[PDB]
């Protein structure tokens, strides 16, 4: 009967236009100040070398505009890698088929490679969980019988959790990205983020702008996804059993309201 | 028993893991040798026109040509239009485009084509996520929990007609699941993706491609519907994001019917190398 779908709906589309808000007070200042900037870069250098005319410059830019579509890429190793951000859904896009059969082979790829990763990322996960379920077991007695009770232990299992995986799964794949591609603090923790929650964008990978990298790194990278992708797969599944609370609470909440406003107000 | 059980199961997941890295060699090997001879032309061809344009323009910096490249390269990052002329341009962080970037993010889909800069804008990002992909997720939920019932009323008609003399029902389940893929791929991929080859002007492959990573949450962002300026009516970038909430749930039951068949081929071709290594030709 209750559809139920009408209050999430409005929900999101009001988060995305928050988020919408948020974005381009947070982005189109910068997007202004790099645009005019250019347009002074470009203006230099027509000056500044008058052996380019005013038509070879734009000659050029379409050069490099059709050097967009492709630009060594695709190694034995690379297209092992791409492999990785198809079936994972990652798809950073940094690399992406441009043959008509490259396209047909991924479509298929996809369509068969998904499905197959979920069951390998279900192993890991059931491999991941009963591993951190023995480590509780022995931290749920040496403090539990003292003071706290197991109903409120629940909130201090559940942190050890989220602070021990942050350690593992975010504090120290960023640290080690941040000595490795020389990124920053925030573009380390930003790559984690967007690796593991599977959005991808591919504005910032541990494989491309490939200067220097060994074969000793790449492998462990994919492997810190597999593990890593289980990691946030709970952590974004406890983060929906909050707003699952949440929901529930701010629904009686009104319920509660909506029963005294109501009451009162119907004697007469 | 209780650890028992858990010997059985890590012996499957490296099974698993073997079945998958060999997938992913599989691939490469294949991509490799579907994409690398287009690289090859692309990489040489580009530098006679790099060999071209050191000769024709010797006064030019011969050498920070390199260093304009990598400045446009850098360029490419952001949403520009540096020419002559059109030096005035639109921004890809309108009222409209940041509110299809969210939608990129908490689908999980991410194109990339819009990206933020800001060291503010990362971390609201990164926080926009972490709870804004639990949100969507629940949305999922609810529509196709919508969706799924949708089609069960117009199976239920279905597999009634469908009742004739001796008619299995056991079989019948395979004539109303292959109903589902059959109107489903119309609706979500078929009628889509002649829209966007009119529309975004993409070939027939390009709109199938996208609707694919689009679908199946990849979102490379090599071919995206909101990505160039074209016209964009603005009764179409709603739509957009409204067919990937609707598809998304297509394929969220169509890659776990994918799975369910590769469950069953498991056992089948597990228990068929049993056949095999019971008998070894008697
Ligand atoms: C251009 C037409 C592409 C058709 C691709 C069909 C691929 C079917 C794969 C089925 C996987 C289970
Ligand atoms: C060294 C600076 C790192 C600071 C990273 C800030 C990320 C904020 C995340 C907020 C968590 C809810
Ligand atoms: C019935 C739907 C109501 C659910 C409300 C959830 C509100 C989430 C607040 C998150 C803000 C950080
Ligand atoms: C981002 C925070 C959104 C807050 C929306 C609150 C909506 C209240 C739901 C009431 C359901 C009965
Ligand atoms: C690509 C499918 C590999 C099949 C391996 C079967 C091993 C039992
Ligand atoms: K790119
Ligand atoms: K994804
Ligand atoms: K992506
Ligand atoms: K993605
Ligand atoms: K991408």
Same mark, same amino acid.
């Given at each position: ?12 589309? @009001?988060?995305?236009?928050? %988020?919408?808000?948020?974005?381009? &007070?947070?982005? !189109?200042?910068?997007?202004?100040? =790099? ?9 230099? /250098? ?8 005013? !038509? ?48 047909? *082979?991924?479509?298929?790829?996809? @369509?068969?490679?998904?499905? $197959? ?9 059931? =491999? ?36 021990? %995986? ?34 991808? /964008? ?20 994919? /492997? ?9 797969? &709970?952590? $974004? ?19 509660? *309201?909506?029963?005294?406003? &109501? ?6």
């Amino acid at each position: 009967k209750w559809k139920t779908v009408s209050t999430i709906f409005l929900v999101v589309v @009001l988060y995305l236009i928050i %988020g919408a808000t948020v974005f381009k &007070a947070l982005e !189109q200042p910068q997007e202004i100040s =790099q645009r005019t900037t250019i347009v002074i870069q470009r203006e230099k /250098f027509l000056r500044a070398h008058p052996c380019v005319s005013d !038509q070879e410059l734009d000659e050029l830019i379409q050069q490099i505009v059709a050097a967009i579509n492709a630009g060594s890429h695709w190694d034995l190793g690379s297209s092992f890698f791409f492999a990785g951000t198809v079936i994972t859904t990652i798809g950073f896009g940094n690399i992406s088929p441009r043959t008509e059969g490259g396209k047909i *082979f991924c479509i298929i790829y996809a @369509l068969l490679g998904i499905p $197959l990763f979920g069951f390998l990322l279900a192993g890991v996960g059931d =491999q991941l969980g009963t591993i951190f379920g023995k480590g509780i077991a022995k931290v749920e007695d040496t403090f539990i019988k003292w003071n706290v009770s197991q109903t409120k232990i629940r909130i201090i299992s559940t942190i050890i959790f989220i602070l021990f %995986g942050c350690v593992l799964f975010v504090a120290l794949p960023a640290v080690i990205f941040k000595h490795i591609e020389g990124w920053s603090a925030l573009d380390a923790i930003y790559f984690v983020v967007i690796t593991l929650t599977t959005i991808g /964008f591919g504005d910032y990978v541990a494989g491309g702008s490939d200067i220097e990298y060994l074969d000793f790194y790449k492998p462990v990278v994919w /492997f810190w996804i597999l593990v890593g992708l289980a990691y946030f797969a &709970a952590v $974004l599944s406890m983060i929906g059993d909050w707003l699952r609370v949440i929901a529930k609470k701010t629904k009686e909440a009104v319920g509660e *309201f909506r029963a005294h406003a &109501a009451e009162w107000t119907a004697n007469v």
